[PDB]
Symmetry: D2
Subunit: 264 residues, 4 copies
């Protein structure tokens, strides 16, 4: 059985994770770390619901000594992850961190402390197992098919192109793929931009339409063939089998692992 | 029965058309208009094969008076189509023209002459019925889904991006779709080119990989849905059901029609 | 301006339609026809919310005389549509019916009455414009590509295979496509069922997975090419541009139209 | 440099392999093993072309002693592979076998002999790297997404459904995926066959159309997401990067490897 506490239960990711943890047969949600803005009207922004089973704490120190969870799932913000991770790792709690955060120096302090205490920690910048396998498998495939393109498609409210997942995908592929540009050397755009963006010579195209959520295809060309990997995320439940896997696996490892590609 | 003569039988399109006409139950190939470069070694560049059934002519005047074909399928070059079309239309031969050619003034002379002689003429810049239906249907769909993107994919020897078919597709859609840009007004590329090219606000993306031949997808977004039209051409047989349809239909019309979208 | 009343506002389709009508600039939601089961606890099943702008009626007679809506959008049940449609058509209200209902005889009474009163009526068994265009366009395409397959994909709670939309698609195509079977005459299944179901010789395949919502692809083969039409519905907002179109168009027609393919 | 001899150079696979070996910078085609049917008119069925560089042998014993190739690529028939493989392995030639062949007992004799002689042998029932990676990656993915479907699409002259590649894919997945059926327990087909074939509960669907060559998609469902692997083969050049990889890698291994999934 794994007793889980969640930091940031009211967030978009947090509300899904609450549901996932409560519904996983071998997990029990035992506490949350939460606090609202001082200006939040309860009418607009309700409190996390009061229960005996899931008390709400405002600070992690207090949660840990009272509840002694097995696992802390941190769905807070990049400014808070280092102090939370260090606190867990000194108190025999396995932290599972969903974040874009940590400095180099901060991550090295966490890594060393997890190692000496023989305590697991997983830092997952992308919990969605389909996305992570897409990227992991693309990087293995690029040893055999060095000509590749990435097409990513999102809703039309998204502010950044290309997506973070496409940039990460291109970085992973570029660890394996020899650096080169693609397309005939003499090709020329007659409408500026037709060929897309380039990362290390890898073309990346960004589609933005109503109706779409989050989608990526990776297209590997070679003589006489096409090999394609695709991930479609229709909602934030897409991230939950990575949350589940991370909570299960953190219990079994004795060091810090950064990125789910390193343990799937 | 329709007695067909072919201009340019040794060309990439011509060799397919020869096969198609010979194998269509209701057509007979009765002559070809052909000539080689004065420097063509027969070892490299064979003559069209000699037969009693399919004589070879060097000029169209001579073909027409000797053979009196029902239909002339012109697979020659843009510099020759006007004189060929005029000659047919004055000699009771229905011309079917595969070309990017004609000036405005030339096409108006052909149109008027076909009309007065009550003789059909089809000019087809794209014979592939799947491509033409893709475009025709996209232009009807754009009345209901004004947010659309085009993704075109070709082999990596292609020199121009975007493809002619994508440009034509975008022009057809823009006849119906109100002019607007797409994507959040505040979106910004962090890798130049990610959002593609724009035609009248329609994004167009160009993929260039080994293995691919010629492919296009048109993606129509709206709330809660995606509607997609796609054409894949694996070889030049893709153009042959348009060749067949044009030869059949030219016999039945009494005026010049430019573009297969206007008669499918 | 079009003053709209909705029958069945708490239904899955109804709740979306309420939102759509309230948010369309040229429509005003002026009333609902609604009633709950006598055993519905308000705690489980709330009343439609009380407002001055949108009164709730238990019977349509009463709604019509008090509110005199321009359009009645019926999202009730097959047992109620005939009496509702007849009542509208005698009271100068344009009915827009979302239903699998009507008998032959019932529909003929509605058709005749709409015609004599010069009043529009639309009956839409499928409001999703992308789905309906998919089917309409497939039926036009089947004149040129008689070899076709349908692949439909839904969530894994769905009880019927194939879907109603696939059956309707196959019926529409079969109006145009000559009846024939496909696949080599000597082909044999070594694992029973591999080739799918057949409707008039058209193969139909049904995919059932978690994660999927409602999806269909129609694949048209021919020499050297593939032409594909696809619709993806991610949520019930997919049906709302047909609801909007129907309410707009019913005002402009003077007879009953059955199926949106007949007016898009 | 690797000196390669090819068995069966005039076969569909053989003619591609001849080209591939001749064009690979580090390979030299040094001989072929070939013979025609006694009834083959040279007019219909030409001899492999005569050259000093690539002599033609009728038996492998004779080829091996005269030419002493590094690698023998066997593109012959299942009845001949065992005797060819044994002969190579006793004569310091690395055999690379493209076949559906070998008995259990035959393969064990080859395995043992390769091991004692510290000589590489690769037996590849599927040379296409995209196909093999598709299958290998699907089997890894099935540890995280146990609900999966296979859709395979081929030309309409194919006699068997499902394809061998789909059957192999399903067998590979079933090594990892817990055995279960999919779809609602109460689902019912209203048109027989809609749900496809089942292998260990894995649904398999077979599409047969003109225009298609050889295609497979593997669809992995889970909450809120879809993860898809796809391979498209447009021609027999699709198999050639596996031929190249096998010839390179056989030189580096010291035992027999059956199936490219075991060394990619």
């Amino acid at each position: 059985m794994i007793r889980v506490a969640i930091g940031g239960p009211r967030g978009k990711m947090g509300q899904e994770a609450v549901h996932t943890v409560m519904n996983n047969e071998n997990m029990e949600l035992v506490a949350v770390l939460d606090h609202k803005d001082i200006g939040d009207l309860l009418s607009e922004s309700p409190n996390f619901p009061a229960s005996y089973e899931v008390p709400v704490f405002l600070n992690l120190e207090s949660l840990i000594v009272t509840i002694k969870p097995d696992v802390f799932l941190d769905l807070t913000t990049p400014h808070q992850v280092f102090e939370h991770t260090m606190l867990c790792l000194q108190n025999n709690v396995r932290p599972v961190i969903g974040t874009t955060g940590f400095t180099d120096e901060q991550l090295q302090q966490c890594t060393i402390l997890a190692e000496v205490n023989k305590l697991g920690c997983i830092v997952a910048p992308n919990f969605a197992i389909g996305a992570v396998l897409m990227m992991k498998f693309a990087s293995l495939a690029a040893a055999y098919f060095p000509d590749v393109e990435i097409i990513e498609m999102h809703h039309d409210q998204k502010l950044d192109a290309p997506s973070g997942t496409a940039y990460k995908t291109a970085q992973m592929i570029a660890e394996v793929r020899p650096s080169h540009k693609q397309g005939h050397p003499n090709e020329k755009e007659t409408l500026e931009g037709a060929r897309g963006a380039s990362y290390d010579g890898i073309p990346i195209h960004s589609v933005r339409l109503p109706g779409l959520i989050a989608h990526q295809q990776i297209l590997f060309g070679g003589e006489g063939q096409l090999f394609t990997l695709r991930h479609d995320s229709y909602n934030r439940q897409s991230f939950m089998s990575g949350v589940t896997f991370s909570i299960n696996q953190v219990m079994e490892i004795k060091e810090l692992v950064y990125g789910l590609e390193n343990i799937l």
